[PDB]
Design a protein around this ligand. Structure first.
Ligand code: SF4
Ligand code: SF4
Ligand code: SF4
Ligand code: SF4
Ligand code: FES
Lengths: 58, 127, 196, 166, 754, 116, 120, 58
């Protein structure tokens, strides 16, 4: 196990960032799914069958 | 309990004497040990009135004729001991409250200690 | 469990079956019979060939049959529409003299590169493999490096007035072969484990 | 012919040079990820003459050798270095580069300074971004000639006359 | 053999053996502290307590080691109860063991420490640890007591290792220590106050704590950090395996390397502490005589000089005179060179009138199988630890059983605190020896008388009672080993008589020489040419010197090339080229051990600056002389060695070289065989290795000498200050002067300088 | 966060664990083990071992053969990304040229896996 | 502990009358090559004197290899800056700053007071 | 393969404790995972257990 105890200071900040993040995460996501250009750069490409994913190891 | 403190204060005292005799006779003194609990003390409270756990008087040959050791801080059975090399004389200083520092039960004085010393010094006189 | 029909077979074919109490299992095979055996396994529904670890037992404080030993890790991905989580090793001791062994490119295209590494790091030429080249190391350094025999490559660290440390005798570290200052050892220093 | 040899010119031009530092990072390590950090998001570098942060020596002359490297990288780096313009500075960023941290091995190259001359070391792997700031402040006043060594000893205002420039 | 089963494995192992050893053979183990290799056990550590079935189980756990073995025996070591107990005893041990670890310099070698952690741990899976049950104040006793000019003693270290006290009994059979007070009040001390034994320092190694340490390397490095460089000694002709502990390319500490051929686990004091000259200022840049002074030069500058020096030289004008500190390789190369370009002689420094190629060598292990030892010489000085090997012989011990680990760790055959003989050896020294402690047959002879003794034993002169008894004894000794001094080998007639007797009843010889590798160099024909001269004598007008020669040597020359490791007064008005030479530690080559065995000497990792061996330099003189010697590298020399027909890796070699060139004179000053060599008199050993002058009380008196003081003396072998020793075992009519450097057995002329 | 409360933070078997340093002050046996631990370091028993795990980057695991020395006799690292890269010529079949950049990036290269 | 071997330590035995540290052994030379220091921290954990205690420094960077093997006296609790910082502050005559703050000291340090929200 | 070290080699020339230095030094990203995975392996081997709180933190 770890070599020493947690900071007390660890508790406030940890809560804090869990508050902010959900919203933040969304807003990054917000950039992608729409932007029809996002589509046009990504969707078609990155192809590989699941079967081959295992064969070549992913 | 706080017996400890007076003992420590006595240990210094005694030590002081050991030096005095040392200079007096010009006989060799050497500090032997320091507290473990000073070394490995490193932020935990230290407050001992000296740093010195053991010290001795030597003949002038690095051979002691008298050794003088205190007990460490939390090391139970707190006493100060003396012992004369090659004599089998083992002295156990207690402290007795309402009295002072006693040798068995007889109060120590400097002269007592000097007498012990001279008989040591002169008798054993290994060099 | 997919494993089990392999296990009775292994036993039938008398292959020794190593087992650590940590529930890891090897199957000791000869070189020859490997390929086909292993063919049968994939057929038997072995999904995923995870690893190939090439082993150099140049110096070991116990006897082993061979100096070079390969080990495959085969797995059955249960999260796939087939599989059971059936994960196990196959170990195959390998003559130093012939650093050959038929590939398993044949059953997984993962293998390709894995075996390539193993040529580089230990000397093994896997038969039926397209391309040997280093894919990870210079080709200006030779000797199939990363072997016990192979140099360790140290340089003294430098301090004022040229005062230096030479690493390789600095270390208080040891191997089991190594004895250190002690004239013997036993106890803890011959290892230890728990069960409690 | 570079902006020197009259009182005026040398201070002028030197201010110009010093304040316009255009970093070309030579990531190949963890350094890079801290370097993108080092760019933005807490502190800036645009106030130190940097919009250049990217891969062309055709955009830069401040070489940041950032990360632990191997044998295979030495001629590469050498050549990259060569394909910079004539005045050019060598930062040796971090421990991993500078003397090879905790690896003593054939594979690696220890003491990056071997491959190319250096003018600035900045230890620590990882270091703090800010240390790098301190370093370039150094490097600023260094090329300004208002620097020494720890023995009071002066030095050229460039990295590039310690071994051949081109 | 005895049928043992230790737990799960069975071994044959012949009887009379300790359970312990079979345990370790079986790959089972125990904590161990009292008994030790090459030493009779005691029960004291009590760590080897096991239980045994044979099938029942003992009610008391016998120290397995102490007990003998039994067929059909079961040994239980993986016992839960054992482990518990081990811990127990450990705890008990630890009760007063003073906490001092960081500054403990037993440290990595605190085997005790390692056992603790091996076998210890509280009886309780734990959820909370325990550490103790103890908590009272510890004993405080004695520390910082210098025990010796080499050894510091801090008493509360000792675990009541009884090992050293035991050692003193077992090994030298000379005691100086004792336990003092009883019970817990006890502690070991000396009352010698500085232990005048010639073997002492091994106790450092033996000390299974850090109580006895080499002060010289106290607080200087840490145990693990050292490179422990197995290599070879050369400092006595035993030339033991040693281990050069080094950090910063500098010699921290010499420890024993435990070859069981040329020691067992035993070193002389001189060997261990007498190494500081190496650790001290040493020649490390070539010099040449300018016109008035010596000049820092390169090798190249010298080579130019060499050509110059060899531009008016015929090569018969040139003397090659080596140290007695040259390798086989350098020997071989000298041989080949002196063939190639004839020189009037080859010699080496320690060389004698009659070689050791006049006699067989023998083995130490040979000497246990022996009958009687008739001794003429001095084992203590000349071949130090042989003295000890004899002590064992004398204390009756027959060769150790060596197995899959070599030595066991208990003597049952012999058991401590028990007799020795006197009448198993015969002794001739010209004075006092510690041997006389075990000798009854002992005799102080006049210097020149030795021959006569020999004569008398052959029966053509009339011996004493001792010599008569000796005569008888040599008969009755069916395979005695004859031990021969410096006084023997340097005096033709004596040698001849020995040669006869030892032939007559054919029998091997142990030839103690003041030369170190006397025998290899002998074999390498580094002996005078037919017309010849000796190493002592001038025989040339140019010279190469591997050593500082006799004063009279220096006169008779006019170009002198020295490959030395330090400067000496003899040189700055006699040198023409000085060069740096490597230590024997860091030399490379093969030596012929006094046993007869060839040993390689590892190069040690040390600072040296420039110091490119005599091998190269001799080669380069030949280059300067138009002669390519067929080799000048080790590699080719190994080939060439092998060519000369020596099979490496301790070959035994044999050859009889008969040269019996007389050269004796009768002096009145003796070269006393000493245990130290001039250059060793540095460091703290400065005094320890100073010269003594022994003389009969009578002649002391007569010359009105102070018998405590040090007196100036002028010899053709230098001016020494020498402490004045009364000793009636020296007969008056000669002055025995402690010969620092090689050369002993001589009667030499000098003067009592005033 | 819910499941969080006081507790010791490492295994209290001091044989196998370095001891607390607030106790060197106290026992010798402490001191001994402490000293030892940070010098030599323990001997694990002989064995090979592997555990499969889910890293952020995929299948992670170490195949570790120890001979029972103070150092292992084999350290194999299972590096996922490296194996994932094998699938690149495949992944990038017949693709378009500006697209190919992204297709590398999308797979996530950490070069440590690869290079080792 | 140092895997980099970043420490060159010449030991010595203290003066008996004037011991530089109360102990009977001290560090007669204490060098650290910062060019490869691992700053193990494990370092701290092994040291039993608690001598070694990581700082809050990072303002270290210079031009010369061998200047960056920081010495004993640069590695105290008594210096007032980094080597280059200090060396600058003499030639320039300017004072010091270090530009960091913590909430409060680490208990481990108990000498030197750093800027802590109340300094810079 | 233009970079490489041969960690796997080096770590047989360092202690187990020491090896924990190497583990995050090959993952710029999730450092702690390498570390953990290595930790676990060791822990298993000698059979050591980890406190619940420890495990929480981990
Ligand atoms: S110094 Fe540290 S952060 Fe920088 S490349 Fe090396 S390991 Fe990575
Ligand atoms: S004798 Fe051993 S256990 Fe005692 S302080 Fe020395 S090294 Fe430590
Ligand atoms: S000094 Fe050492 S060898 Fe001698 S009895 Fe004590 S512990 Fe044993
Ligand atoms: S007996 Fe001779 S060979 Fe052995 S250590 Fe002593 S001097 Fe060297
Ligand atoms: S009782 Fe100690 S080794 Fe036998």
């Amino acid at each position: 196990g770890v070599k020493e105890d947690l900071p007390e200071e660890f508790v406030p900040e940890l809560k804090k960032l869990l508050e902010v993040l959900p919203h933040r995460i969304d807003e990054y996501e917000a950039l992608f799914a729409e932007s029809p250009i996002f589509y046009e750069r990504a969707r078609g490409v990155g192809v590989i069958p699941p079967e081959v994913a295992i064969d070549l190891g992913l | 309990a706080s017996s400890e403190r007076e003992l420590y204060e006595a240990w210094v005292e005694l030590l002081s004497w050991m030096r005095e005799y040392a200079q007096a006779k010009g006989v060799r003194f050497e500090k032997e040990a320091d507290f473990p609990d000073f070394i490995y003390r490193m932020e935990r409270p230290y407050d001992l009135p000296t740093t010195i756990m053991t010290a001795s008087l030597s003949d002038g040959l690095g051979e002691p004729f008298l050794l003088a050791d205190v007990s460490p801080r939390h090391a139970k059975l707190k006493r100060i001991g003396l012992r004369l090399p090659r004599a089998h004389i083992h002295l156990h200083a207690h402290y007795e409250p309402g009295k002072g520092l006693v040798t068995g039960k007889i109060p120590l004085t400097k002269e007592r200690f000097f007498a012990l010393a001279d008989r040591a010094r002169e008798a054993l006189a290994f060099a | 469990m997919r494993l089990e029909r392999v296990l009775e077979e292994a036993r039938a074919k008398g292959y020794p079956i190593e087992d650590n109490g940590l529930g890891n299992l090897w199957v000791v095979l000869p070189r020859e019979r490997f390929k086909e055996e292993m063919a049968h396994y994939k057929a038997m529904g072995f999904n995923f060939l995870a690893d190939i670890v090439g082993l150099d037992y140049l110096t070991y404080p116990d006897p082993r049959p061979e100096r070079f030993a390969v080990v495959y890790e085969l797995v059955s991905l249960p999260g796939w529409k087939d599989g059971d989580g059936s994960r196990f090793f196959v170990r195959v001791y390998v003559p130093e003299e012939d650093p050959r062994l038929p590939t398993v490119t044949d059953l997984w295209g993962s293998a390709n590169f894995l075996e390539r590494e193993v040529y580089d790091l230990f000397g093994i030429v896997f038969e039926g493999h397209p391309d040997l080249r280093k894919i990870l190391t210079p080709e200006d350094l030779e000797g199939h490096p990363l072997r016990k025999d192979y140099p360790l490559g140290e340089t003294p660290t430098l301090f004022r007035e040229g005062r230096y440390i030479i690493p390789a005798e600095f270390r208080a570290a040891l191997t089991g072969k190594d004895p250190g200052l002690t004239f013997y050892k036993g106890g803890s220093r011959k290892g230890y484990r728990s069960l409690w | 012919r570079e902006g020197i040899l009259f009182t005026t010119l040398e201070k002028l031009v030197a201010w110009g040079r010093s304040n316009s530092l255009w970093p070309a990072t030579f990531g190949l390590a963890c350094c890079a990820i801290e370097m993108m950090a080092s760019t933005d998001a807490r502190n800036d570098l645009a106030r130190f003459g940097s919009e250049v942060f990217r891969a062309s020596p055709r955009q830069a002359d401040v070489m940041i050798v950032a990360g632990r490297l191997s044998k295979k990288m030495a001629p590469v780096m050498r050549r990259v270095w060569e394909q910079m313009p004539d005045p050019k500075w060598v930062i040796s960023m971090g421990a991993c580069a500078s003397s090879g941290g905790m690896f003593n091995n054939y594979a690696i190259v220890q003491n990056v300074d071997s491959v190319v001359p250096v003018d600035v070391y900045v230890p620590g792997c990882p270091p703090r971004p800010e240390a790098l700031i301190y370093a370039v402040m150094q490097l600023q006043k260094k090329v300004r000639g208002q620097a020494y060594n720890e023995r009071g000893e002066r030095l050229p205002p460039v990295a590039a006359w310690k071994r051949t420039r081109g | 053999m005895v049928r043992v089963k230790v737990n799960d494995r069975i071994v044959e192992v012949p009887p009379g053996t300790s359970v312990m050893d079979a345990v370790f053979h079986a790959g089972y183990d125990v904590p161990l502290f009292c008994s030790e290799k090459h030493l009779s056990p005691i029960g004291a550590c009590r760590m080897c307590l096991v239980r045994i079935g044979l099938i029942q189980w003992q009610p008391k756990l016998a120290a397995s080691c102490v007990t003998a073995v039994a067929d059909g025996m079961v040994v239980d070591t993986l016992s839960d109860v054992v482990r518990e107990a081990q811990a127990g005893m450990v705890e008990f041990t630890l009760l007063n063991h003073p906490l001092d670890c960081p500054t403990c310099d037993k440290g990595g070698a605190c085997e005790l420490q390692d056992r603790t952690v091996e076998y210890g741990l509280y009886e309780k899976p734990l959820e909370l640890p325990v550490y103790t049950r103890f908590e009272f104040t510890r004993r405080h006793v004695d520390k910082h007591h210098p025990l010796s000019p080499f050894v510091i003693l801090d008493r509360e270290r000792c675990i009541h290792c009884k090992r050293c006290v035991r050692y003193f009994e077992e090994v030298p059979g000379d005691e100086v220590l004792d336990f003092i007070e009883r019970g817990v009040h006890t502690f070991i001390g000396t009352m010698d106050f500085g232990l005048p034994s010639g073997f002492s320092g091994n106790i450092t190694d033996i000390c299974p704590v850090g109580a006895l340490l080499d002060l010289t390397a106290r607080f200087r490095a840490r145990n693990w950090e050292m490179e422990e460089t197995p290599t070879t000694c050369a400092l006595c002709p035993v030339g033991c395996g040693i281990t050069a502990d080094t950090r910063s390319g500098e010699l921290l500490r010499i420890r024993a390397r435990e070859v069981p051929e040329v020691n067992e686990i035993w070193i002389c004091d001189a060997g261990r502490f007498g190494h500081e000259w190496a650790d001290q200022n040493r020649l490390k840049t070539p010099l040449v005589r300018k016109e008035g002074r010596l000049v820092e030069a390169t090798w190249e500058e010298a080579f130019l000089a060499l050509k110059e020096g060899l531009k008016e030289a015929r090569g018969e004008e040139v003397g090659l005179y080596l140290a007695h500190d040259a390798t086989l390789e350098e020997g071989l190369l000298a041989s080949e060179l002196a063939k190639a370009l004839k020189t009037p002689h080859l010699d080496f420094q320690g060389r004698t009138a009659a070689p050791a190629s006049l006699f067989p060598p023998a083995s130490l292990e040979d000497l246990l199988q022996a009958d009687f030892a008739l001794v003429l010489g001095d084992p203590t000085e000349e071949a130090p630890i042989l003295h000890l090997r004899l002590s064992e012989f004398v204390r009756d011990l027959k060769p150790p059983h060596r197995y899959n680990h070599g030595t066991p760790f208990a003597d049952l055959q012999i058991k401590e605190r028990m007799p020795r003989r006197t009448d198993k050896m015969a002794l001739f020294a010209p004075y006092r020896a510690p041997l006389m402690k075990w000798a009854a047959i002992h005799e102080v002879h006049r210097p020149g008388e030795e021959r006569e003794i020999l004569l008398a034993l052959l029966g053509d002169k009339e011996g004493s009672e001792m010599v008569a008894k000796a005569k008888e004894a040599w008969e009755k000794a069916k395979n005695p080993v004859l031990i021969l001094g410096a006084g023997v080998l340097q005096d033709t007639v004596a040698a001849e008589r020995a040669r006869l007797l030892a032939e007559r009843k054919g029998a091997k010889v142990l030839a103690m020489t003041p030369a170190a590798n006397a025998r290899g160099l002998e074999a390498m024909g580094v002996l005078p040419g037919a017309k010849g001269a000796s190493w002592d004598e001038p025989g040339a007008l140019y010279a190469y010197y591997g050593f500082v020669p006799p004063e009279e040597a220096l006169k008779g020359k006019r170009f002198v090339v020295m490959h030395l490791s330090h400067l000496h007064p003899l040189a700055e008005r006699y040198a023409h080229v000085v060069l740096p030479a490597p230590t024997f530690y860091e030399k490379r080559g093969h030596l012929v051990n006094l046993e007869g065995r060839v040993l390689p000497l590892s190069p040690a990792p040390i600072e040296n600056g420039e110091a490119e061996g005599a091998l190269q330099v001799l080669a380069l003189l030949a280059e300067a002389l138009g002669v390519r010697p067929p080799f000048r590298l080790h590699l080719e020399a190994q080939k060439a060695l092998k060519a000369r027909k020596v099979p490496e890796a301790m070959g035994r070699l044999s050859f009889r070289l008969k040269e019996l060139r007389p050269k004796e004179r009768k002096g009145a000053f003796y070269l006393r065989p000493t245990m130290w060599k001039a250059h060793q008199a540095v460091g703290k050993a400065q005094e320890a290795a100073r010269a003594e002058l022994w003389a009969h009380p009578e002649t002391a008196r007569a010359e009105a000498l102070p018998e405590g003081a040090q007196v100036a003396v002028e010899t053709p072998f230098g001016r020494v200050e020498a402490r004045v020793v009364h000793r009636e075992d020296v007969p008056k009519g000669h002055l025995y002067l402690s010969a620092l450097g090689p050369a002993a057995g001589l009667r030499v002329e000098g003067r009592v300088l005033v | 966060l819910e499941r969080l409360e006081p507790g010791p933070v490492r295994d209290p078997n001091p044989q196998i664990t370095p001891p607390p340093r607030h106790l060197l002050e106290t026992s010798m046996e402490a001191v001994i083990y402490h000293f030892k631990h940070y010098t030599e370091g323990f001997h694990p028993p002989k064995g090979e071992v592997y555990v499969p795990t889910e890293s952020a980057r995929g299948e992670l695991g170490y195949y570790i053969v120890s001979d029972g020395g103070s150092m292992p006799y084999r350290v194999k690292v299972r590096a996922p990304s490296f194996v994932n890269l094998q699938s690149l010529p495949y992944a990038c079949k017949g693709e378009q040229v500006p697209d190919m950049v992204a297709i590398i990036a999308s797979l996530d290269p950490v070069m440590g896996d690869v290079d080792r | 502990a140092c895997p980099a071997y970043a420490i060159y330590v010449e030991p010595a035995e203290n003066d008996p009358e004037n011991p530089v540290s109360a102990g009977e052994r001290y560090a007669k030379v204490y060098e650290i090559n910062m060019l490869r220091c691992i700053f193990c921290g494990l370092c701290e954990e092994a040291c039993p004197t608690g001598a070694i205690v990581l700082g809050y420094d990072f303002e270290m960077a210079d031009y010369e290899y061998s200047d960056l093997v920081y010495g004993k006296e640069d590695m105290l609790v008594d210096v007032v800056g980094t080597k280059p910082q200090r060396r600058e502050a003499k030639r320039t005559g300017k004072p010091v700053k270090v530009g960091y703050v913590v909430p409060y000291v680490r208990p481990e340090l108990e000498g030197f007071k750093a800027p802590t929200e109340g300094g810079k | 393969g233009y970079l490489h070290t041969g960690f796997e080699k080096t770590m047989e020339h360092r202690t187990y404790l020491q090896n924990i230095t190497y583990t995050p030094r090959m993952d710029y990203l999730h450092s702690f995972a390498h570390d953990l995975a290595y930790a676990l392996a060791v822990e298993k081997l000698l059979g050591a257990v980890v406190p619940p709180r420890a495990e929480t933190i981990r």
